[PDB]
Design a protein around this nucleic acid. Sequence first.
DNA 1: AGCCGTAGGGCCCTACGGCT
DNA 2: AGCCGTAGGGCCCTACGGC
Lengths: 670, 672
Amino acid sequence: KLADCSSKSPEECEIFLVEGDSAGGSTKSGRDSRTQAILPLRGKILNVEKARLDRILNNNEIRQMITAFGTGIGGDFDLAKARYHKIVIMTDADVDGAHIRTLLLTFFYRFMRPLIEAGYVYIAQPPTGYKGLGEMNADQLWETTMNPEHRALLQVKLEDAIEADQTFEMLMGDVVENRRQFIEDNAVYNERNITSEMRESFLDYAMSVIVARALPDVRDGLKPVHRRILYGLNEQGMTPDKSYKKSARIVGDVMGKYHPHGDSSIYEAMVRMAQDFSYRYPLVDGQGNFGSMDGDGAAAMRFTEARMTKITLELLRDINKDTIDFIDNYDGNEREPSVLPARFPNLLANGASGIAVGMATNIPPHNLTELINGVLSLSKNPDISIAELMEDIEGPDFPTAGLILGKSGIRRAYETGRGSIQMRSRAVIEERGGGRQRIVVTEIPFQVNKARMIEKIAELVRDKKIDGITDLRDETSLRTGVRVVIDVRKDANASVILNNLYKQTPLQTSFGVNMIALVNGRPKLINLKEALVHYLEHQKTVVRRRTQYNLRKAKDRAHILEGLRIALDHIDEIISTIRESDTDKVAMESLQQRFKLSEKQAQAILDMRLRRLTGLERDKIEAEYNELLNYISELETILADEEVLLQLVRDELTEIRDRFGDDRRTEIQL
Amino acid sequence: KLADCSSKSPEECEIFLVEGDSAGGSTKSGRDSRTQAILPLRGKILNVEKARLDRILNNNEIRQMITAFGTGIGGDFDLAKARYHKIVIMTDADVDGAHIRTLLLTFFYRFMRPLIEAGYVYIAQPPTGYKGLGEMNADQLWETTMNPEHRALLQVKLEDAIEADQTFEMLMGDVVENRRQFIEDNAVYANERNITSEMRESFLDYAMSVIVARALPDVRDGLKPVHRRILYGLNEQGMTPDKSYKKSARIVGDVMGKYHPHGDSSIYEAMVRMAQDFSYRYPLVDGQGNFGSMDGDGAAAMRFTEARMTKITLELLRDINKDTIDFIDNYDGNEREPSVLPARFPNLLANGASGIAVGMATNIPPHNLTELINGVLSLSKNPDISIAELMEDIEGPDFPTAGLILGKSGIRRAYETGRGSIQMRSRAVIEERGGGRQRIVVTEIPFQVNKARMIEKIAELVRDKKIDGITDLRDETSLRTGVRVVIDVRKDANASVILNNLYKQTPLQTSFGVNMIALVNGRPKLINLKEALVHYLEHQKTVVRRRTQYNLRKAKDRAHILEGLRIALDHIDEIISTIRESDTDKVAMESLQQRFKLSEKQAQAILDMRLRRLTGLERDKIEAEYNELLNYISELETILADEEVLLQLVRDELTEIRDRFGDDRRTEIQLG
DNA sequence: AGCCGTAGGGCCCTACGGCT
DNA sequence: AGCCGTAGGGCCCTACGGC
Ligand SMILES: COc1ccc2ncc(F)c(C[C@H](O)[C@]34CC[C@](NCc5ccc6c(n5)NC(=O)CO6)(CC3)CO4)c2n1
Ligand SMILES: [Mn+2]
Ligand SMILES: [Mn+2]
């Protein structure tokens, strides 16, 4: 992998460490091949702080660096046997590049500490504004970053060693709480000391993963990748009435315009939203192989096609009506939504799961009818308890159905935001004839791989870890649904074999609820009431802003129509005014003066076509106006009374509940 | 990789062979898990007719098939050991799916012949209009292709065994001539199944598709479908040299979606090549980021790169909007695409072409644009111009990598027959380096030669004592210096002797084997330099003739509209009252038409007229446009009435392109 | 040989948290 | 131990023809 230099005098030789071959190519073209070597790594390197020594010494990327430096590791480390006097870390000018830098400084600190001590370790500084060095032209990477005449390099300096020893243990170690504490105390919503560098770069990454990757927003229940996918579909008119659009086009559009990450991350997020076993209310409607419950992946994006589901329209409803705030995209060239209008409670409906830095999230799916009735009960009573809300919201409702054992785990999860929810498969004991029996599984727990589960039972039987099982078959079909058959030995108690399967296999899986969502852009552990309160505050805002916008637009349009009506009342005069004018400026000024018209009104008259002078067209102008006057009155009523605004929110949620609300799938047992 | 069925009774068991995991998923979801098994392959299978046994037996896909069937192969073939009584070939409903089918049948016929004799081999029939079984929903697949209650399976039948051996030999064999002769004899340009008929039809659909729609360039624009689709793709989305760079993935996805139903790398890599100044004599793509090197390094992932048209590409696309070329329906009928680009410069000869098809291959070298244009101007003035007179203009190929060409001999043979071997030599010098010692400095290498790989080949000869006198070898190439390969010479060793050996033993000297095959009326044809130029000129004459014809239609329509607005402004008051007293737009139309002697288009142009057109400046503006239009109409009719005038217009336009884009010759033709 | 360039097709290593 | 889901990064087999 190493693209070495001509020279063999380490004192003048430099080694540049890059993320992969895309950045490597630009680097090999722009460099000085006499004194500058290039080692392209393969993305994220191993965390030596969290890893076992054997794993470290056998890792291909760790080995490639050891071999290239020629200094050996730990105690056998000889700074004399070094092949470069500058080890230059040149990761990409993004948050994951900062993370790879922290992962590298950690390996150098725990294994090659004298390399830092000798001042041999540097950090390159490529221009921000690129996603990778592979986006840069060789001449651009050279002058800015690699030429010793123009480059700005940071030399890594280890000042206090005990402070550094505590830093690497805090940020890179296996104890989460210390990292969480560090993020909480520090989050904000030339030589360089290693401790400062590790703290600033790790906080850059942690923060970014927390607010812009792994955690959902409380208002719409979406993570940046899902929001950008849905918006991408909205922008391209990939609505349910239109035909399916190729996945490659959606992925490429979303990536180019909103998501500066790999295709794999975008396509896989899109695929999951299109799976009925993953989403309680699927957001994407996919044509083709979108994977299975057996862990089978979707077909490559060239084969599949997609569009929004009917319910996705409710997530994007009124986005163009000044309901939500837009922000600049990653490069300034595009505008993206900060949140979606979310006309149905998506956070609780589809749930969420995401591994962040210092924290994680695990919100289960819920039944739409129960959520809406929950939100409606809350609208009528701000003081409602979790117990009362539970009269509406019984508990989670998995797309895979099954059983939940007891309401105590649910109660605790809705009150504290944390709890263990015991899930069970739908299994029954039935006869197969000849005095023999079988166990028939028709519903498996949520997020459990059906094939992998069957293989675990197979494994237990083969290893004689369970008694009574004579056969095991997956009789699932498009036609009969999920059907897993476990044949029992004649005279053996099948209820005992079933109880054993529940203790030994994923046939019984628990769901550890950990309700962390972004509230006002900060991660917060929330309870059931809080999740709903935030959803309702959001809906009141969306509806109010839509009404304020529709009113501004209706007034602007009534204004224009008042001008067209004046023109229809004085057509000969209007014509004479335009005809007697040499320019469009003169006509516009003369019209404004003669008929007390605004600039907007006179431009509208000047833009009016001759076909608009016929009987039908004259009528259309009068009818649009009379309709709009009534519409302005209707809107002005909504903004004059807060109880009328709140009742519209309730009426709109009621319509959604009546159209999209479905039956409970998951049975809650006592 | 096999997803077997639960039943262990071969009689009721079926095995489906699919192209990969994308098709497998859809297949696995729709099937009857009790009776149907799925084996997903990994694309194109090995051709057993062209392979030796060590290779056949080491192949993962071949191995996976033998194991799943359990019958064994050749002499040890046992039909009783068959785990399935139905081996169903289920490749995608595309040309490549037909090729994979011929590849699978060749293996079954050569290694598992009794399995065909027994009637255990069948061919599935999925619907077309899908990109792969991975595009179909599971329920759709079961109904149309897998359900025994509704499917239509062809059972492979071996009729005449002597006839089959020859069909497998001719089509899949190592001798290219018999295969080429089969395509020449059978090509047409512009239930049980007989193995021979299946092989002949599927292989011919594949062969014809690679020839007319993949590997060979069109004589008129010099482009292959992928490149023409990329360039049309950029044109549609306005990714011109004046606009900013657009994301590589957005281009790739758009082109794949709308025009090219093929894999992503194929699109991106064709776009990358068109952007490389060492690949293209006149690059067609302007790229931002890592687009590869002469060292065989590939481009950065498409997520990193940005692209747009070069100024020269605007000349390839110039007049596409003006009815010059025939548009055709795309692969799925939802879009329209050009069959050929107007190509205002001779692209086939300028950038060359390199392609491996079925039964043939093409190898066309790049040329200097100033020379080519001068050659076309010469042929326009003299239809009977000889190849010898053309060579006064077109000296020989002119590589983007410069270098040297040894003699006019190979060039002359290639330009007269379309076939010749042209010796390409590196630009190499012998210079002193101090201490009474010398070195060989290489600054230009031959075309399509990987620099790093050539250096590795020289290093190899030195390590393996096959060359004497070399002491060191370095690549000193930089953005500052340009290509610079340094070979150190041992003190007192003859440096020219070392150099002459390096030419004889390494890519330092390479041969360009000219084989000028291009599509002519959609048919592969071996053309010489004159025929290439003749076909280019005729295409240009038609492009200009059609553009002229289009503008004349456009102007005459415009003049007719203006005649109506002229009448409307001369009677504005009666025009307004006519419209004011009309209940509907249709009534106004009919009224303006009868009263003022207007046509449907004229009456509609008046009804669409905005009130601002009634200002004083407008009636004068209209009479100005109408009068400059009459002059314009006259000019166009003059061009279309005299062919000499039309030909002079072609000459003029090519002379401009020559003065705007013509560059100096890079490659030196040394008389050796 | 093994390369040239458009085509078919897919796999595996890393981080990060909380649960088992 | 290892699985869940957004992220960093890349490789290798096959057909085809002409030297
Ligand atoms: C797969 O099975 C294997 C097996 C082994 C492999 N070993 C190494 C290796 F690097 C890869 C991956 C391969 O290198 C790629 C990487 C990204 C990939 N999509 C890019 C993209 C990004 C953005 C896009 C589109 N495509 N397509 C579009 O149409 C527009 O948007 C193109 C190449 C998909 O696979 C392997 N893949
Ligand atoms: Mn990166
Ligand atoms: Mn295919």
